[model samples]
Target chain A: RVSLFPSYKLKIIQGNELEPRAVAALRPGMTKDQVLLLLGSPILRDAFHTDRWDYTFNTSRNGIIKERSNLTVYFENGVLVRTEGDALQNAAEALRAKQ
Target chain B: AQITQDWSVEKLYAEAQDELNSSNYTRAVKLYEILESRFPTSRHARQSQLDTAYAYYKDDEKDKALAAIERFRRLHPQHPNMDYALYLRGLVLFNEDQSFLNKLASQDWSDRDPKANREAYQAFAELVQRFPNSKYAADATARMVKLVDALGGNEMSVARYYMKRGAYIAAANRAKKIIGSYQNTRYVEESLAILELAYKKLDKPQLAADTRRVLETNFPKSPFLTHAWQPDD
Candidate 1:
C-alpha cells in the first residue's frame, strides 16, 4: 500500500493474517477497547494516559510481502488515531525526512 | 462636525505615527486601518503594509502580521521593502512555534490528520526554507532539532513502555519502529532490546537469534548486552 505516514505502505503477500493482528486496522472512532478486541492487547501503554497503546507487528517472511505486512497503531485520548504499517519504514528518519 | 472635517488624512497619519512611536501598537493599528480605508492611494500605503505586520506582531498575532508582510512582498517584490518583507515572513514564522513544524512534517504524509507536533515542524521548516538569510534562521534551526528530538523522545518513551510490559512481541515491534523510523533518536539501544525480547517471546527463534547476533556484533558495549541470550535450537 502507498502510505502517507511511516507505516502506511503495508504489503501482505503471504501473511495477510498478520494484518488483522499486527496493529489492528483502526478507523477514526475506534475506541481503545474495540482496538483491543480486534488486535488483542497492545504491547505498550503510555504511563501518563492509558489511552495510547502500541501494537507493533512484523512479518518474518522474506521479500516485498514481509516489507508490507507489519504495522504500528497509535491512539489518542483512548480513541484509535493512526494505523501505520511497514514498521521498518516507520523507523527510518531519512525516509521521514523526505516528507 | 467641523472639527472632525478639519482633520486631514495626513493629520490622521501623523497621529498614527505618534501612537506607533510610543509603542502603542494596538492604537497604531487602528489608526493605520483608518488611514488605509480613508486614503487607499496615499503615499503611506506601502509603509502601512509593512507596519501592519509590525502592529500585529506586537499584539502577538503573528499570523496576521505575516500575512500583511507577505502581501507587501508580493506587491513590491523588488522594492527596498522586499528585504524587510522577507525578514518579516521569517520573523512571523520564528514566532509561530505551532505552525512552523506542521508544514515541514506534511510533505510526505498528508493523508493522516496533522498532529500538533508535525505541524510545529512544518512551521519551522517554512521559515528555514523561505528565508535562509534571515537573522532568526539559526534559532529556527535549533528549534528544529529540539522538535525532532522531542519527536524522537516521544517515540522512545512509547517503545520503552512496550518493552517494560513483557509484550515482547509488541515491544519488539515498537523497538524496530524506532530503529527504522527515528534512527537518530537516543533510544536505538533500548528499542533493539525490546525487539530481541519480543522475538524470543513470540517463539521466532531464528529471527531472535539473528537479531541477537547482529546486536552482539555491532553493539558490543551496550548495556542491552546484559539481557542478550542465544535462542534455543
Candidate 2:
C-alpha cells in the first residue's frame, strides 16, 4: 500500500488477546473454573484442541497485523496440567516496546 | 412593515440570525423560510436549511428537525458543514435517547428493539470515518462507545437480571452473547464470572471448571473470585 505523508491509521484489537500479566498468571492444576475465572475463555474453541484451549490475540494497523501472540492451555482430567506456545518472559515490556 | 422592505439576502439572514440567537426558534424558522423563499439561489438559502434544522432541534420539533437536516444533505451533500449535520442527526435520534449499565424495571430494553441506537451509531460511525479530523469527531467517538454499550449492555443487564432471578440457563445464554458480540465492553470480564456460576448451578461442573480457569487466567484477583456462589437479588 502506498503511504500518505500525513495519513491517519487506526489500531484495532482482534480476537481473545491475552494480557501479558494474565499470561503470567497461568499455573498447573488450576481448576477449569479457576482458569475461566481468569482468562475469559478461548477464541479457538473445540476445533483445535486435544483437551486444549487456544487464546489468540492480535493488533493490526491498516489491516496489517503489527503484533500477535498465541497461548495454549493444556488440560488433563478436567484440570490445567500445563501451558505452551509463545514465551511469556518479558512479554510485558516486549509487548509494550513492540521491537 | 417597511415592505418588511428591501427583503434582501443580508437583511433576511441578519433578521433570522437575530431571531435564532434570541432563542426565538419559531420566529427563526419563519424568517429562514422567508430567507430561502425570497432568495432561492442565494448562498444563505443553502445554509438556511441547516440553521432551520438546528432551530427545529432546539424547539423540540423532532420530525421537522430530521426533515430539515435531511433536506440539507439532499441539497448539499458535500457541504463543509456535513460533519455537524451528521453529529446533529445522532444527537436527535439518541435524544429521541445511558447510564446504560443498569437496566431499570420501568425501562423497556426489549431495546428502544434498538432502532434508535442503530441509527445513532450509523450516523456517528460515519462521522468518525468520513470526518475523523473534524472537531465533532472526538465526542462522536465517545457517543459511539456509549451507544455500543447501550446496545451490548442490554445483554449485560438482562443476563445479570436472569442470574439474580435464578435462571442459570437464561443467564448463561445472554452472558455468552457478551463474549460473542461485546468482548470490547467492560461487561465481558463480568460475563465469564456470571456464566461460571451459571454452569455450576446448571449441573455442569466441568464447564464451570473450565470457565473459572479461563477467568482466573485472564482476570486474576477479580472480585468474582470472592463473590458468593449463589445468584443474588
Q: Pick the candidate with the highest DockQ.
A: 1
Q: List the TM values for chain B, per candidate.
A: 0.60, 0.84
Backbone clashes for every candidate come to 27, 32
Per-residue accuracy of model 1 over A2-93 as CA lDDT, tens digit each: 34355555433222233332332446778867766776665544332334354444353222213323445656766766665555454454
What TM-score would each prediction reach against the true structure?
0.48, 0.62
Residue B80, candidate 2: alpha-carbon lDDT = 80
Error of 2 at A90 (Å): 57
Indicate the TM-score of model 1.
Answer: 0.48
As a whole number from 0 to 100, the lDDT of residue A15 in candidate 1 is 25
Evaluated against the true structure, the overall lDDT of model 2 is: 0.70
The weakest ten consecutive residues by lDDT in model 1 chain A span: A60-69
**Candidate 2 on B69-179: residue-level lDDT in tens?**
888878788878788788888878776433455647465333664677888898888778888797656788887887787888677767877554444545666776677
* Worst lDDT 10-window in candidate 2 chain B: B96-105
